[PDB]
Structures are given as C-alpha cells and as structure tokens.
C-alpha cells in the first residue's frame, strides 16, 4: 500500500474458554444482558451488572465474563443474536480474561471466585 | 469458503497435549540427570544426594 503494509485484522477469540459449567435445562451459569450502545463485546471480558465493562477501581462489581463477540454498530452478535450473554455463576473457565486497563486481575478474580467461578491455570 | 471440522480441532488438541507431556518428560529427565528432581514450579520431590548420603 502507501505505507508498505496492510493488516486485515486479528481473528476475534472463540468460545473455548468454558471448561465446566452447570448444565441445567434453562441455563444455570448463563445470564442474558442487553448491549450498551456503541459497546463492542468479545469473549473473555468481565462485565458489570448493567452490561458495561469493569473499569479501573470498580473491580468489585465483576458480574460476569462475556462469551460472545457482539458487534456494536449493527446491533447483532457473533452468532446473529440480539443479546449479549455472559457466564455469571459457578463454572470453571480458562483464565484468558480480557481486562480493560488499570483493572488488576487479582481483585477481579477474587470477586468472581466468591460467585463460584474458578479459573484453571492456562499456559502458552 | 471451507468450514472447520470437529475432527481437525480434536486432532489439534490431542497433539498439543502429547507435545506438552513430551516436553515435560524431557524437562523432568534433565532435572533427574542434574541430581535433584525439582518440579517446574520449584517443588522438591527427591533429593538424591541426601537420600543416598
């Protein structure tokens, strides 16, 4: 190009972070959110109660972690569904968390641990 | 326009698991050759020099 390089984009993460979860018929660990406007969601980010992301300081909220790749502009999602869903109850997940900036991980994990979410150590 | 198959992902995961165990076995064998069997985390499991005095 006129810069010698063009990047078409990293692939968004897949929903492989779930290792164990309750398999109740109506969904035990899955909770349904509604997109905040102009907000992009990817699998692995910690979400507050009102669908928003956890920022610096407010690590205590940490309601759930997203498991879908919602696209904000067209209001649709990774699999074509109108809502964003996260894991918010007892489950075991890989610690591939996406945290904003300033949000330490120890406080976020401790808040999630009190809610039954366990993080299996992952390695690469 | 080709979709991925479950078999491909399966094969990838099992191959990675075998590779991980192989490299861990190599590391453990090297540690045993050194003289003390120390885990990658640093936990001591066998001190041969004090066992055999």
């Amino acid at each position: 190009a006129y810069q010698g390089f063009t990047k078409l984009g990293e692939r968004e993460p897949l929903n492989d972070i779930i290792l164990w979860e309750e398999i109740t018929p109506t969904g035990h660990s899955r909770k349904e959110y509604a997109p905040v406007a102009s907000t992009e969601y990817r699998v692995g980010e910690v979400l507050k109660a009102d669908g928003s992301k956890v920022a610096a300081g407010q690590e205590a909220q940490a309601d759930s972690v997203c498991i879908v790749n919602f696209y904000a502009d067209l209001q649709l999602s990774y699999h074509g569904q109108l809502k964003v869903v996260g894991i918010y109850r007892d489950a075991e997940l890989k610690d591939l968390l996406k945290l904003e900036s300033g949000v330490d991980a120890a406080a976020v994990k401790s808040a999630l641990k009190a809610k039954g979410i366990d993080f299996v150590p992952t390695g690469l | 326009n080709e979709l991925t198959t479950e078999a491909v992902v399966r094969a990838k995961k099992l191959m990675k698991i075998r590779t991980k165990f192989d490299i861990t076995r190599e590391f453990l064998f090297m540690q045993a050759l050194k003289g003390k069997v120390i885990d990658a985390n640093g936990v001591l499991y066998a001190d041969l020099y004090k066992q055999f005095d």
């Binding site: 692939r11 968004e12 696209y71 | 326009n1 979709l3």
Partner: protein, 52 residues
Amino acid sequence: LTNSEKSRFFLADLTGEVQSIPNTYGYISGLGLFRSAPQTQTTFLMDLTDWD
C-alpha cells in the same frame, strides 16, 4: 457460503438475487396496423384526386 459481515473468518450464505425488471407495453405494436414501406429517398410525395 461467501463470508460473514464484518469478519473474514466466518461464513454466511448468499441465498440468491431478487431481480426487479421494468415493465413495457406493446399493445399497439402488437395490433399490427401499420404496413412497412421501405424507400430510398428522404422524402416522398402523394397525389390527391377527387371528382366530386
């Protein structure tokens, strides 16, 4: 199976096209009233005669 929207790593299905063609009328031309009279010059003349 072409590609997904806003991602080059997922696939969606191009089910098809919906063509929308304009409508034309051909009743008068189908009546076939006019007779073809090919000619070589750019103008022609006729004679009008009436005994009355």
